[PDB]
């Protein structure tokens, strides 16, 4: 099947289009779950074809970055340390380590938070928890026509997960703490209503983070 | 739990009203101070130009 995907990835016009199948995660899963020599080699071949045949720079960056959102580069270093006798493994590992060696710098920004929002993977992650991010960047919640605010608002509107809800309330609390105009922006977006409703959420972690956000929103 | 959250909300309400009263007190004081400063500078500048012309 990954040989079928490697063959599909021979054309630049196919690599531009194949993105909508969400194929990099399933190859990255097998790349962790299956160290078999053939399987390793044909994933490296498929990943090399996707990235290298992407003549569109956005598509090249997107394949390198999707592999880095799957953290493929660390597994390629594990596979570089693993014993393999084949140059068609070794040289395609080193190729992808170099190209994903670009997009690792893009992801390992504060944008690991941007990707956690974009993917909906809200958690008590180090970049959610650390003050430095908000202290240096909180205003950026307004970027791409308020995209990160719109995500947090939608998650506070329709998420089922009390961690996501409480994380988002914490994110709103630090957003207002580190960007004062952010209070006005949440008040203009009406996002406060979600936080004020989640004061009576069924989870004490949500209720606590909702109250804490109401404190950081209304109290100096 | 939830009555004690309402006690904390009442403390927050008291802080909000108190610091709002402090902001009113500060701005009302700084209004009268900057009235004394600005009137005093403005009269004393123009009065002294008139004094030398005559």
Curated annotation (Swiss-Prot), chain B:
The modification Phosphotyrosine is found at residue 53. It comes from the Eukaryota. Expressed in brain (at protein level). It is found in: Apical cell membrane; Cytoplasmic vesicle, Secretory vesicle, Synaptic vesicle membrane; Cytoplasmic vesicle, Clathrin-coated vesicle membrane. Subunit of the V1 complex of vacuolar(H+)-ATPase (V-ATPase), a multisubunit enzyme composed of a peripheral complex (V1) that hydrolyzes ATP and a membrane integral complex (V0) that translocates protons. V-ATPase is responsible for acidifying and maintaining the pH of intracellular compartments and in some cell types, is targeted to the plasma membrane, where it is responsible for acidifying the extracellular environment. Belongs to the V-ATPase E subunit family. V-ATPase is a heteromultimeric enzyme made up of two complexes: the ATP-hydrolytic V1 complex and the proton translocation V0 complex. The V1 complex consists of three catalytic AB heterodimers that form a heterohexamer, three peripheral stalks each consisting of EG heterodimers, one central rotor including subunits D and F, and the regulatory subunits C and H. The proton translocation complex V0 consists of the proton transport subunit a, a ring of proteolipid subunits c9c'', rotary subunit d, subunits e and f, and the accessory subunits ATP6AP1/Ac45 and ATP6AP2/PRR. This is V-type proton ATPase subunit E 1. The gene is Atp6v1e1.
């Amino acid at each position: 099947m990954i040989f079928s995907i490697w063959l599909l990835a021979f054309s630049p016009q196919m690599c531009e289009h194949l993105r909508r199948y969400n194929i990099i995660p399933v190859l990255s899963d097998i790349l962790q779950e299956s160290v078999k020599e053939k399987v390793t080699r044909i994933i490296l071949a498929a990943f090399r074809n996707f990235l290298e045949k992407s003549t569109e720079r956005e598509t090249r960056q997107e394949y390198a970055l999707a592999m880095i959102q799957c953290k493929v580069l660390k597994q390629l270093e594990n596979l570089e340390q693993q014993k393999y006798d084949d140059e068609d493994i070794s040289e395609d590992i080193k190729f992808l380590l170099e190209k994903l060696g670009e997009s690792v710098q893009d992801l390992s920004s504060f944008d690991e938070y941007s990707s956690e929002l974009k993917s909906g993977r809200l958690e008590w992650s180090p970049v959610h928890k650390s003050e430095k991010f908000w202290r240096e960047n909180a205003v950026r919640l307004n970027e791409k026509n308020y995209e990160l605010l719109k995500i947090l608002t939608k998650l506070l509107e329709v998420s089922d997960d009390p961690q996501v809800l409480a994380v988002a309330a914490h994110d709103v609390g630090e957003y207002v703490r580190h960007y004062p105009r952010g209070k006005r922006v949440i008040e203009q977006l009406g996002g406060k209503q979600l936080v004020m409703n989640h004061m009576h959420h069924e989870d004490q972690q949500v209720r606590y983070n909702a109250l804490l956000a109401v404190q950081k929103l209304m109290v100096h | 739990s939830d009555a004690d959250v309402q006690k904390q909300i009442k403390h927050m309400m008291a802080f909000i009203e108190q610091e709002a009263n402090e902001k009113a007190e500060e701005i009302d004081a700084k209004a009268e101070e900057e009235f004394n400063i600005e009137k005093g500078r403005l009269v004393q500048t123009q009065r002294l130009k008139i004094m030398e012309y005559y």
